[PDB]
């Protein structure tokens, strides 16, 4: 069995047009292997397609990491009279995360083909793609690719000459991070405020327009055709156990070369920064902390970044999570309190306001953290702030409440001395 992960070869990379150095339109994508033998895949049936996703070990790439094959099989049932839909989550709102953008604008035909194959596995009649409204130029690229697929018979009536009917629709957001939440996305497509629904019912029973629905991330949908062509076993030969496959990474912050790159799951975080991002600005020893999977994940200090792997289970044991695998690097000259406070301000601006612990609690944590930045607090407030975040976490309708509590807890967990020190500075300045 494999033991060390990384050094992904170019022949085993899925998004082979990540940087846009090749023609993104149909002609280029087909020449790179997209849309190949899709008819053969469709005619093998939904049970076969769902089997390959299950074996591949694929897990949701939107932030929660649920096993994709098991989740998609929820819709593998007979029709009860209603249409069935696939909703592709291209909202791409989590701060630090910009991977889904490159797929839409440079690899659009993998997303369109993934919609058809993934849509077949679920028995869905059409796919609605929800792309955030700020991605106007990327939404326009996606529409052009969709028209090309329609004009070649790949999607629509008798898709790929398969006897299966499939429409791909693009619907644009209007500026709301919460609409990336799976049920808040559905409510937005239906024309309401982007406010999450409680569960149950689950989307696979009552979804968009009250119909069976699956919400899947762009990267999750855009790798299924390759998983079917090359086999789930090939995909399962990467990463650790229950952390299979290749993964797109965004390295931003205080690195020499911020970039988006594909890499193997379970790659060491140190290796990913050094090999692809050109190292931490000022040398590895200048590293202060890393937010490894988007603003929703807790930060981790340099002493934990030395050996930590980049996968769902390795980061969970480091008291964080892989999330969207968006690495934000903070070197030793960062004001760590201010950086986290700016994240709580973001969550304050993004809360939908529906439910009490987030509508009131997140705003409350924002005010406390603004004072913590200046030191205008007492040390006893640190434990109060921890307890407040625990009242938000696990008590809200959606996970945005959890995603606002975790970054606060990560800060207090690893940088309490910096919090207490700053309060002591403020107290002496005003004595």
């Amino acid at each position: 069995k494999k033991t060390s992960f990384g050094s992904l070869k170019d022949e085993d990379r899925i998004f082979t047009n990540l940087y846009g150095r090749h023609d993104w339109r149909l002609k280029g994508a087909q020449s790179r292997g997209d849309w190949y033998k899709t008819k053969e895949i469709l005619l093998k049936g939904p049970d076969w397609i769902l089997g390959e996703v299950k074996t591949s070990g694929l897990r949701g790439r939107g932030g929660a990491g649920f096993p994709t094959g098991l989740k998609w099989s929820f819709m593998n049932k007979p029709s009860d009279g209603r249409p069935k839909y696939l909703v592709v989550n291209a909202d791409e709102g989590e701060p630090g995360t910009c991977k889904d953008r490159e797929i839409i604008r440079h690899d659009p035909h993998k997303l369109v083909e993934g919609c058809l194959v993934g849509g077949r596995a679920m028995g869905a009649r059409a796919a609605y793609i929800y792309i955030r409204g700020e991605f106007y130029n990327e939404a326009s690229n996606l529409q052009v690719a969709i028209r090309e697929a329609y004009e070649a018979g790949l999607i629509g009536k008798n898709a790929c000459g398969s006897g299966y009917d499939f429409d791909v629709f693009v619907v644009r957001g209007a500026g709301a991070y919460i609409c990336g939440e799976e049920t808040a996305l559905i409510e937005s497509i239906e024309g309401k405020q982007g406010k999450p629904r409680l569960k149950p019912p689950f989307p696979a029973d009552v979804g968009v327009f009250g119909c069976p629905t699956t919400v899947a991330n762009v990267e999750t949908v855009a790798v299924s055709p390759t998983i079917c062509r090359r086999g789930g076993a090939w995909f399962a030969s990467f990463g650790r156990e229950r952390n299979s496959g290749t993964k797109l990474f965004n390295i931003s912050g205080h690195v020499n070369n911020p970039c988006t790159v594909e890499e193997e799951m379970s790659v060491p975080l140190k290796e990913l920064i050094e090999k692809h991002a050109g190292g931490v600005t000022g040398g590895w020893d200048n590293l202060l902390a890393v937010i490894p999977g988007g603003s929703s994940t807790p930060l981790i200090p340099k002493s934990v970044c030395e050996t930590v792997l980049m996968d769902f289970d390795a980061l969970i044991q480091a008291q964080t999570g892989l999330g969207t695998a968006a690495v934000i690097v903070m070197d030793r000259s960062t004001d760590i309190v201010k950086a986290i406070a700016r994240l709580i301000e973001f969550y304050k601006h993004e809360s939908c306001g529906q439910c009490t612990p987030c509508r009131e609690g997140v705003d409350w944590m924002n005010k406390v953290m603004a004072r913590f930045v200046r030191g205008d607090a007492r040390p006893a407030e640190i434990d109060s702030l921890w307890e407040i975040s625990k009242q938000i976490e696990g008590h809200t309708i959606c996970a945005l409440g959890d995603g606002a509590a975790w970054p606060v807890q990560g800060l207090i967990r690893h940088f309490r001395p910096e919090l207490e020190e700053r309060m002591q500075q403020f107290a002496q300045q005003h004595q």
Binding site: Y19, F209, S252
Partner: protein, 213 residues
């Protein structure tokens, strides 16, 4: 930043608004994207369309979309106020939107913000006296690795320095349309200094396909 409406001479229910004949055909295609009996799903795309025609949404524009889709006006008012991309007050010809969230803040988006204010003379949230520009901070725009970045209308201008953004304002003042994308030495999201991946020629159709199709 007020979520109640008070009628004014330039913003009241009698304020003239209607879609162009061309925009009524676009609305028809928007409505057909959704199941019959759920035309309310078209509220977001149709309000956005009215904003593109008019530049902002007067209360009469919201009242018009409500009528065309047979939706209560209040339910249209809820969508307009909820989503931040809808402009309920007029904005300048160029709506500059600087990202200030942490990944961009770490790459000194403060300098970009300061440069725009210094060049235009305005503050965040204000419109220039000639009504050409409007300036606001926004949350993450999904271009984090290309920070610091701004969005002016539908275009992203990325990897900015104070000099770069100042030039972009100059090009806009002259009526020109600056090229979007990074203003640094790269094209999109690739590492600066040469690619660390995807340097082989991509494998063509059929590569690595399991037997049995």
């Amino acid at each position: 930043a007020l979520f109640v409406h008070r009628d004014t001479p330039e913003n009241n229910p009698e304020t003239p608004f209607d879609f162009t004949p061309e925009n009524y055909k676009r609305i028809e295609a928007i409505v057909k994207n959704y199941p019959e009996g759920h035309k309310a799903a078209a509220v977001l795309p149709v309000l956005d369309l009215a904003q593109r025609q008019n530049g902002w949404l007067p209360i009469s524009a919201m009242n018009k979309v409500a009528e065309i889709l047979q939706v209560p006006p209040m339910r249209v008012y809820e969508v307009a106020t909820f989503y931040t991309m809808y402009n309920r007050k007029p904005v300048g010809k160029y709506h500059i939107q600087v990202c200030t969230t942490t990944p961009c803040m770490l790459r000194n988006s403060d300098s970009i913000l300061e440069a725009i204010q210094k060049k235009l003379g305005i503050k965040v949230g204000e419109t220039t006296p000639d009504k050409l520009f409007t300036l606001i901070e926004v949350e993450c725009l999904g271009a984090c690795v290309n920070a610091p970045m701004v969005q002016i209308n539908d275009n992203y201008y990325e990897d900015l320095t104070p000099k770069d953004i100042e030039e972009i304002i100059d090009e806009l003042k002259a009526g020109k349309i600056p090229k979007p994308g990074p203003r640094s030495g790269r094209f999109s999201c690739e590492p600066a200094g040469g690619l660390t991946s995807l340097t082989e020629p991509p494998k063509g159709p059929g590569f690595g396909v399991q037997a049995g199709l």
